[PDB]
Structure formats: C-alpha cells, structure tokens
C-alpha cells in the first residue's frame, strides 16, 4: 500500500506541475534520497500523505517564488538533502506551521540576493542552515513574529565577511563562532536587544587579534583557545 | 601474502555454500566495502583468518535460519556495512564468543517476525543495533543469561509505536531517548527489575505532554528540553 | 572570474611538471572532490591563489621526494581528502609556513620507511594524520623545532603494535588511547620530558590487563571503562 500511495503522490503533483521545470528537477533529487525517502515512506505509514503532499506544495511556491534564483535552488537542494532539515520540516507541517516554514524560505532568499557574489557568505548561509539546532531557532524566532531580526544576524554577518581584509584566518574563526548553536543564539539575543553594532564590536576585535599574532601557528592557537 | 589468504578464504567458503544464495549476495556486500575488508586484511596479517572464517560462518548460519526473511537480510546488511559493527563482531570471535553473537543474532529477527510490516519499528531497530555503544550492551546482556529483557525491551518498544496515535512528534521523541545509550541502560535496568508497565508509564506521559502542548513549536521545545 | 583563476592555475602547474604523473593523477584528485574544490574557489575570490599555487608545489615537490613510495602517497589522498586537513594546510600557507608543512610531509614518509609491511600501523598513521586536532598538533610541534618528538612518538607506536602478540583487543584499545588528541598530547608531552620508556611500561601494562581478563567480554568492558 505505501508504494501505491507514494507514487500516486508522485505522479499528482508531477502531473499538476508541468510548468515549472525546477520543482521536477527537485522533485526527484528528493526520491534518489534513500535517507530521506526513507522518511516519507514512514509518513504514509503512519496515514500523514498529507503532510507530505503540503510540504512539496510549500517547496512548489519556493521555486515559483525565487524562479530563475540559481543561488538560491542550490540552497534547497542542500537543505532537502539534509534527513534531519528534511524531517522538521515534515514535523513544521503536521504542525500545521507551513506559513512559519514559507517565512524563513524566504528570509533566505532575500540574504541571497543581498549576497551578490559573496561566495563566502554563501558557504556560511548553508552551513548554518544544514544545522538542525540553528534551523530549528530560525523557525523557532519567526513564528513568534521575530523575523527581522534574522535578516538583521544575517546582515552583521555578511558586512563580517567583507570586514575580514580577505584574512582567510578570521573567517574560519568566524565560521566556528556562528555555527556553534550556543554562541549562535548568544548573537541572535544580542541583536533582538539593540546591540547590533556591539556585536560588531567584538567582531573587530577578534579581527584585531588575529592580525596582531599574525603569522605565528603558536600565537593563533591560543586565540582559539581564548573562546 | 595478505591478498593470497584472502581470495583462499573468499574461493573456499564460497565453493563450500552454493546452494546458499543469500549468503553468497552478502559475502560480495562485505567485499565491495573498502572499510570493512581494510578489517579483514588488518586481522590476515594479524594471523587470525579463522576468526574472519568464523564470523562468515556465524552469518551463513544466520542466512540460512531465516531463510527468506527479507526484513532481517536487510539488517544484515545494515550491520555487516558498519565497520564498527562488523569489527566489534570479529572481536567476540576471537574471545570465543560466537554464541553469544548467534543468539543476538536470532533475537532481532524475533523482533522482526514480531514487527509484521511495522516499519517504524524496524527503522528503530536498524538505529539502534548500529549503534556501537548499544549493539556492545546488547551483546553483554546475552552473555550474562539475561536474553529475554532484550526481547522484552524490544517488545515494549514495539508497543510503544503503536501507542503513538500516528503522532510524528512523539515517535522522534521516542527514538531520541532509546538511542542515547546513557537511557538506554537505564531503560534495560527498570525492565530487568521488573518495572516493564512503569516504564510504559512514562511514555503515556510523554505522550500526554506531546498532545498537550500540539501545535506550537515553541511549547514543544520546552518539553524536548525537560529531558 | 573565479572559474578562469582556477583553470588557470590548473593548466599552468600541469604543463610545467608533466614527468611527475603521481602529482598529475593527484591533481585530478583534488579536482574531483567538490568539497575541497569549494575550498579552493572561495580562496580564488578571496584573492589568495598564491596561496593556492604554494601548496601546490609543497605536494609537489612531496611526491618528488618520495618518488615511487605508494604506502606514501595513499596517505597524501587520505590528508588532501580531507576537507578539515587540506584547509588548515592553506592556512598553513598563507601564514608563510610551507617549510612546517614540508618538515611534516617528511616524518611521516620516514615513519612510512621504517613501519616496512605493517598495515596495523600504516592504519593508525592514516587515523591520526586525519584528524584535525591531532595534525594541528603535528604541525605545532613542528614549527617551534621539537620535530623528533613526533618521530619518537612515532616508533614508540610502531613498537607497541609489534609489542601486542597479535590480539585485536590491545590494538583497538591502543587505538582509543592515541586518537583522543587530549591523551595524545600528554603522550607527547611524557616523550618529550624523557619518559619514552614509561609511556612503554604502561602499554605493557593495558596488554597485561586485556590477556588477564581475556576471553570474558565483562571482564574487558571494565577495563575500558578504567581509561
């Protein structure tokens, strides 16, 4: 029975979206997914087929609503990927929090296109939203109705990119400061209170630090250590 | 030499089981795996070689007592591909413990002839029999004597599936408190006491809690915390 | 752009060294994993490529100096797959230490001469040097001079998978003991100090404990709970 039922999903959606090219592509980097095939398989078990048929209607208005946005797909695609992002967002639906879910999708996608070939904060943006402690909390800050302050982190963060004199030291330190789910609420507190250039402020002054042990291994590793 | 006592290993258990399909369909499994054979050419210079020609007499007699059980060959699969499983099992042959792993071996295929195509059930099983830690705990109850608490174990797990109300939520909840091994345990503990209701007791709570807060992600954080 | 600077680089560093096929066939390696290839297109955009045309000679002139030495260069696949070791080797680059790197690159092609056909070390070799903190830690020791601490701390290793009488249980327990980098410095710190002999003694003393309790699988549980 769940085969039946899961390829009669399939073919619904396929069939009712022809027009859209890149939720088909998509579509199927979902079913090639054993892990995360795997989990929908157990939802028609378990009778949601629901859940399942409004997340891909909530993938299918992200598509439709970015279009020709390539940085931003790839960014599903690595999300979809993921079993546990895969999971919470099937968790955020029967739920019935598919509004809260649409709301980050797109969060994303205006730090993508505010992004401008900043590859650096590209490579941030997926490493923060593939974790499941740090997605939980984006989802977590706006349905409580907090969702600029998101797109506020998410800003201080892209202007610490470009603050970095292309130090590739100070972003890999950087990189180990946001993604820790500790330090990372830390930082979403500090900004939901009005210290958004506070924040900032340490930000330079572990830039500074960096610069000043400079091209000493010894001198860097107790830096790190200081955290 | 390593590759010579090897291919006599592979040529001699393959040419003495032919009649044995689904054995010769899981030797090639363990050869294609690079982690799991860089075990097997660790313990040929080692100068074991019966221990890895008992162990694959150990899953021969195991494929062949299940027969067509397609639901354990796929567990197979999923424990013989996991170089920790796999390495901790050729370390229960050489202490001379193949009987112990035989038993384990038979009771998970007990669980599975218990499941009757209850799939979240049978994803609980491969999560936690890969698990190092538990797969270790589970071999060390059968040693003792104490073989029925794992089948007891497993059955109350089992009804505890069941005793979800199709609630996606809860069942995450369940796994994430059976796979932690330090819970694990203490589960084992109050089911070899005698407390095989009590602890049951506590999932109708959690249950309880589940439905309680519903759809709001925010009371459901709390109660995920509150462990 | 970024795409030019690579190909670039790419095509410049291939046509100058065509005799080297092992740097040729390890080039396409690099290439071909879309992981440590992403290292690199964000070390383009941050307008290092120095950096980048630095290490590539470093691996360079490593797989010259060893020449045909292939238990060497299976280890440079495992280090430069790595995406954690590949990155901190071109931050090892942009602080100007390619000559720390190279001294390291060199001590474990002699440990690699002088393990001579013993595939239980080769593995721990791999293990280590895969690990961040520990080759963080290699490089360290490196830098401030004392380098044949690390070579010493080498063989002591080598000697005590000769000094195991072929049990499994003892090598896999040596394995927990050096992997955990917080043991593996105070390792490094007794060697250091002159205890290359006591760190000895207490290998002696883990196999007398793993023969003492030998075949009971609770005896040994114990003893690794003793750590």
Same mark, same amino acid.
Do not use: C, H, T
């Given at each position: 029975?769940?085969?039946?039922? =899961?390829?009669?999903?399939?073919? @619904? %959606?396929?069939? &009712?979206?022809?027009?859209?090219?890149?939720? $088909?592509? $998509?579509?199927?980097?979902?079913?090639?997914?054993?892990?995360?095939?795997? +989990?929908?398989? =157990?939802?028609?078990?378990?009778?949601?087929?629901?859940?399942?048929?409004? =997340?891909?209607?909530?993938?299918? @208005?992200?598509?439709?609503?970015?279009?020709? *946005?390539?940085?931003?797909?790839?960014?599903?695609?690595?999300?979809?990927?993921?079993?546990?992002?895969?999971?919470? =967002?099937?968790?955020?639906?029967?739920?019935?929090?598919? &509004? #809260?879910?649409?709301?980050?999708?797109?969060? +994303?996608?205006?730090?993508?296109? &505010? %992004?401008?070939? *900043?590859?650096?904060?590209?490579?941030?943006?997926?490493?923060?939203?593939? *974790?499941?402690? +740090?997605?939980? +909390?984006?989802?977590?800050? #706006?349905?409580?109705?907090?969702?600029?302050?998101?797109? !506020?982190?998410?800003? /201080?963060?892209?202007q610490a990119?470009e603050d970095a004199?292309?130090?590739?030291?100070?972003?890999?330190?950087?990189?180990?400061?946001?993604? &820790?789910?500790?330090?990372?609420?830390?930082?979403?507190?500090? /900004?939901?209170?009005?210290?958004?250039?506070?924040?900032?402020?340490?930000f330079?002054?572990?830039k500074?630090? #960096?610069?000043?042990?400079?091209?000493?291994?010894?001198?860097? !590793?107790?830096?790190?250590?200081?955290?």
């Open positions: 029975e769940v085969k039946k039922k =899961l390829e009669e999903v399939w073919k @619904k %959606a396929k069939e &009712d979206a022809g027009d859209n090219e890149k939720f $088909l592509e $998509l579509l199927e980097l979902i079913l090639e997914n054993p892990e995360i095939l795997e +989990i929908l398989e =157990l939802y028609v078990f378990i009778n949601k087929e629901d859940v399942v048929e409004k =997340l891909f209607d909530v993938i299918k @208005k992200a598509v439709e609503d970015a279009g020709d *946005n390539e940085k931003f797909l790839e960014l599903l695609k690595e999300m979809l990927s993921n079993p546990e992002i895969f999971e919470i =967002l099937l968790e955020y639906v029967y739920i019935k929090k598919e &509004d #809260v879910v649409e709301k980050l999708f797109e969060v +994303i996608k205006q730090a993508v296109e &505010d %992004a401008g070939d *900043n590859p650096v904060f590209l490579k941030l943006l997926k490493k923060m939203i593939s *974790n499941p402690e +740090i997605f939980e +909390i984006l989802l977590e800050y #706006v349905y409580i109705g907090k969702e600029e302050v998101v797109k !506020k982190f998410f800003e /201080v963060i892209k990119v004199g292309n130090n590739p030291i100070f972003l890999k330190l950087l990189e180990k400061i946001i993604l &820790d789910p500790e330090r990372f609420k830390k930082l979403l507190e500090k /900004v939901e209170v009005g210290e958004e250039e506070e924040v900032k402020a340490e330079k002054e572990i500074k630090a #960096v610069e000043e042990a400079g091209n000493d291994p010894i001198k860097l !590793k107790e830096l790190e250590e200081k955290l």
